[PDB]
Amino acid sequence: SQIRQNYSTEVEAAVNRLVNLYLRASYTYLSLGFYFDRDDVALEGVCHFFRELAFEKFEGAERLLKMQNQRGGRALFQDLQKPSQDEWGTTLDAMKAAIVLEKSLNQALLDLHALGSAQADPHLCDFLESHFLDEEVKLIKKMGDHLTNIQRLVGSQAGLGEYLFERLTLKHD
Amino acid sequence: SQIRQNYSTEVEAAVNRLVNLYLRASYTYLSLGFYFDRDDVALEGVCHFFRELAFEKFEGAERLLKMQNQRGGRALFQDLQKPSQDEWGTTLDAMKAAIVLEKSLNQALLDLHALGSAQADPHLCDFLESHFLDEEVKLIKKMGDHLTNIQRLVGSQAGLGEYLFERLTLKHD
Amino acid sequence: SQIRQNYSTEVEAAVNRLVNLYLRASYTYLSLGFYFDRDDVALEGVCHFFRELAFEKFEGAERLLKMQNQRGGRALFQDLQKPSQDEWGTTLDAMKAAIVLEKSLNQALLDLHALGSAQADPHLCDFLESHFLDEEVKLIKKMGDHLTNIQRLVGSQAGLGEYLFERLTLKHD
Amino acid sequence: SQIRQNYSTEVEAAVNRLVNLYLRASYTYLSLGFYFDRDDVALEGVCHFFRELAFEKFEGAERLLKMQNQRGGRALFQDLQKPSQDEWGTTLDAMKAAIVLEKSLNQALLDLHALGSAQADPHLCDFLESHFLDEEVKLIKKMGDHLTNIQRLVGSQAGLGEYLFERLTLKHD
Numbered sequence: 001s002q003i004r005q006n007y008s009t010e011v012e013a014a015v016n017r018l019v020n021l022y023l024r025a026s027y028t029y030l031s032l033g034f035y036f037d038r039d040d041v042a043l044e045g046v047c048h049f050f051r052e053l054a055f056e057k058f059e060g061a062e063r064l065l066k067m068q069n070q071r072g073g074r075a076l077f078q079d080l081q082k083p084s085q086d087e088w089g090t091t092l093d094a095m096k097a098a099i100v101l102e103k104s105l106n107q108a109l110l111d112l113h114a115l116g117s118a119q120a121d122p123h124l125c126d127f128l129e130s131h132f133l134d135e136e137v138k139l140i141k142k143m144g145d146h147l148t149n150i151q152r153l154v155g156s157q158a159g160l161g162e163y164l165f166e167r168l169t170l171k172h173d
Numbered sequence: 174s175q176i177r178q179n180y181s182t183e184v185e186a187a188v189n190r191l192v193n194l195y196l197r198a199s200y201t202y203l204s205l206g207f208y209f210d211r212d213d214v215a216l217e218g219v220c221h222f223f224r225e226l227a228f229e230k231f232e233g234a235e236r237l238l239k240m241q242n243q244r245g246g247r248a249l250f251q252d253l254q255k256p257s258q259d260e261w262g263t264t265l266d267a268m269k270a271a272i273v274l275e276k277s278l279n280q281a282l283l284d285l286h287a288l289g290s291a292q293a294d295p296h297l298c299d300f301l302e303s304h305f306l307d308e309e310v311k312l313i314k315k316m317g318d319h320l321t322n323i324q325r326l327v328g329s330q331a332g333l334g335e336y337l338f339e340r341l342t343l344k345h346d
Numbered sequence: 347s348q349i350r351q352n353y354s355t356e357v358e359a360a361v362n363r364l365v366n367l368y369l370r371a372s373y374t375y376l377s378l379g380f381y382f383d384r385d386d387v388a389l390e391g392v393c394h395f396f397r398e399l400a401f402e403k404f405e406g407a408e409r410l411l412k413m414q415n416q417r418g419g420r421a422l423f424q425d426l427q428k429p430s431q432d433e434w435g436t437t438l439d440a441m442k443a444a445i446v447l448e449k450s451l452n453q454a455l456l457d458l459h460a461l462g463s464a465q466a467d468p469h470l471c472d473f474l475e476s477h478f479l480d481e482e483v484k485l486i487k488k489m490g491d492h493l494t495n496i497q498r499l500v501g502s503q504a505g506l507g508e509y510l511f512e513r514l515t516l517k518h519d
Numbered sequence: 520s521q522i523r524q525n526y527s528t529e530v531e532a533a534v535n536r537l538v539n540l541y542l543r544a545s546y547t548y549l550s551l552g553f554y555f556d557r558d559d560v561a562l563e564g565v566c567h568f569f570r571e572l573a574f575e576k577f578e579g580a581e582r583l584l585k586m587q588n589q590r591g592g593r594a595l596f597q598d599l600q601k602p603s604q605d606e607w608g609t610t611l612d613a614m615k616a617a618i619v620l621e622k623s624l625n626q627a628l629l630d631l632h633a634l635g636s637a638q639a640d641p642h643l644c645d646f647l648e649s650h651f652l653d654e655e656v657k658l659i660k661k662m663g664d665h666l667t668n669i670q671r672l673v674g675s676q677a678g679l680g681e682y683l684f685e686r687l688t689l690k691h692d
């Protein structure tokens with residue numbers, strides 16, 4: 001490359017792997033969103049929440065791909081694995097699956113940051129810190145807040161609580 | 174002092190003591206507010222309510238300190254004791270603790286008013302009447318209204334009631 | 347915690363310690379500000395400077411507490427020690443005390459950054475770099491600029507210089 | 520009187536006496552203001568400060584006279600004694616004379632409040648608290664702040680300090 005400088009093959013490959021993880025996450029959120037749009041589930045605020053996350057994760061992949069090119073690396077795409085489930089259960093089940101997904105992306109970000117630090121690649125480290133690490137922390141905090149409210153609402157009237165959460169916390173429309 | 178007039182040492186000291194009580198109250202409300210922002214509590218309206226009170230109590234201390242100087246007294250600061258609890262329980266537990274705190278501040282205001290009356294210090298008495306006594310009465314009334322609504326919502330579904338109170342009465346986002 | 351990830355007990359505790367240091371600093375600045383509002387000191391620009399810093403340091407504590415919760419740590423509050431002095435001397439004495447205070451906060455920030463680096467906690471490191479380290483450097487530079495101007499103005503006419511500094515450099519109004 | 524109620528002859532007379540004191544104070548401030556407008560004194564900000572106070576004290580008398588009539592008492596005017604001096608010295612001398620004057624008015628307000636309290640006349644007490652006591656405290660605090668700044672500026676260059684105070688603290692432009 002005529003521009004590549006201080007950009008290791010290891011980081012280049014890990015970036016491509018992370019693009020795959022973000023596109024898989026986007027796909028998972030597309031599946032979650034449309035599940036909640038089913039006539040027999042019908043929780044608009046939950047659908048909207050997950051569809052928004054599908055877009056956010058795509059944007060994350062886009063930013064990684066832009067940076068790969070800015071650095072002189074080469075984007076390499078792999079097959080995208082389908083989401084882990086076809087049906088996602090209750091809002092609680094779905095929000096738990098989402099927090100599990102987000103922690104896995106966060107760990108991948110942290111692992112890439114550590115590789116960048118080890119390789120003395122401060123542009124990579126700053127890129128992740130400036131556009132991914134705090135965004136992930138903020139999202140996981142939101143999802144934990146949601147889990148706690150969903151859990152408080154289960155009690156002995158689960159359907160009532162699931163409706164009220166979707167109507168009074170989640171944005172709808 | 175070149176300006177001090179009709180301002181007793183007893184009032185000056187009690188004013189400094191009251192500044193301590195208001196800053197302690199502000200600190201208590203800072204702790205309450207952040208407790209409700211925990212991911213495992215997650216009641217935004219309750220957090221906002223108490224954080225607002227932390228500011229209001231600081232403002233109270235500020236006004237007392239401004240008046241101390243207007244009168245020619247000397248501000249004296251003491252250590253500020255940490256709040257009485259690290260974890261604040263339910264919204265009900267917290268609102269009960271807040272009403273207890275406010276009654277204690279109110280009693281301190283009333284005690285200072287009585288000292289001012291005894292010392293024939295009408296500026297002090299007017300100051301408390303104009304900026305503190307009715308503010309306290311209004312706040313205690315609001316908190317009692319809240320307690321009654323929180324208590325009516327406990328029934329056999331406590332989590333549901335705690336969510337609904339935070340969503341439909343407390344300001345959030 | 348359902349959200350805690352890559353957040354050490356050591357960082358959590360140091361964050362709580364730093365909240366204490368920032369609230370102590372806020373309290374010190376509240377005392378400095380009201381000292382300069384005394385009728386026998388009467389330097390409005392100096393009062394305003396320090397009162398503004400009391401708010402800035404509170405805001406710093408607030409940001410730390412928000413982050414503690416975003417990360418899944420638990421805020422723990424301790425007693426707040428009263429400021430080191432009841433009377434703060436001249437503007438020069440006060441500005442020297444403030445630079446000493448700020449260097450101590452800066453060192454605490456640097457120590458926490460180093461702990462975060464050692465623990466491979468890049469979110470913490472970025473948080474401090476983005477919201478605290480440059481703010482501290484900018485403030486210490488301002489205070490040094492002030493010290494130099496205050497010192498140049500002492501000469502053989504200290505009262506004249508103290509008045510002129512407050513009137514022509516410090517904001518009043 | 521067809522309207523007089525709970526309004527003692529003692530309060531009525533003391534109100535008339537206080538009108539005299541306020542008009543005497545207004546006259547003193549008129550003399551101070553024009554002294555500072557002399558071509559051989561020439562301190563516009565000091566002149567403006569005292570002329571403003573002449574108006575403020577007249578307004579005070581006007582308010583007392585309005586209240587006397589609201590209560591059913593009868594305004595009675597006495598001779599107004601000329602100010603204590605024809606020439607007022609330095610800005611420092613003048614500001615000291617003004618603080619002495621204001622403390623004397625404040626004491627008269629406090630004495631009237633105490634009479635009203637003794638006579639169970641809460642309208643009178645509220646009137647003084649709402650329109651006079653805090654206004655007096657605020658003005659005496661301002662004058663003390665001014666005295667301190669004037670005194671700090673004397674040093675070994677009195678004319679320089681007197682000019683700088685008038686230019687940088689007092690309103691002119």
Ligand SMILES: CCN(CC)c1ccc2nc3c4ccccc4c(=O)cc-3oc2c1
Pocket residue numbers: 196197199200203224227228229231369372373376400401404
């Ligand atoms: C002295 C230590 N303590 C008591 C815990 C302070 C000090 C300063 C504070 N300043 C603010 C403040 C300042 C500007 C704008 C809003 C606020 C606010 O909402 C709450 C505050 O709370 C404070 C507590």
Ligand SMILES: CCN(CC)c1ccc2nc3c4ccccc4c(=O)cc-3oc2c1
Pocket residue numbers: 542543545546549570573574575577
């Ligand atoms: C009764 C004799 N005395 C005392 C010396 C008065 C009478 C009337 C006065 N009327 C004004 C006045 C009227 C309108 C607008 C502004 C002003 C003012 O700035 C000061 C005054 O001062 C007064 C003193």
Ligand SMILES: [Cl-]
Pocket residue numbers: 081082
């Ligand atoms: Cl698969």
Ligand SMILES: [Cl-]
Pocket residue numbers: 254255425
């Ligand atoms: Cl304690």
Ligand SMILES: [Cl-]
Pocket residue numbers: 252427428
């Ligand atoms: Cl101490």
Ligand SMILES: [Cl-]
Pocket residue numbers: 600601
């Ligand atoms: Cl005479």
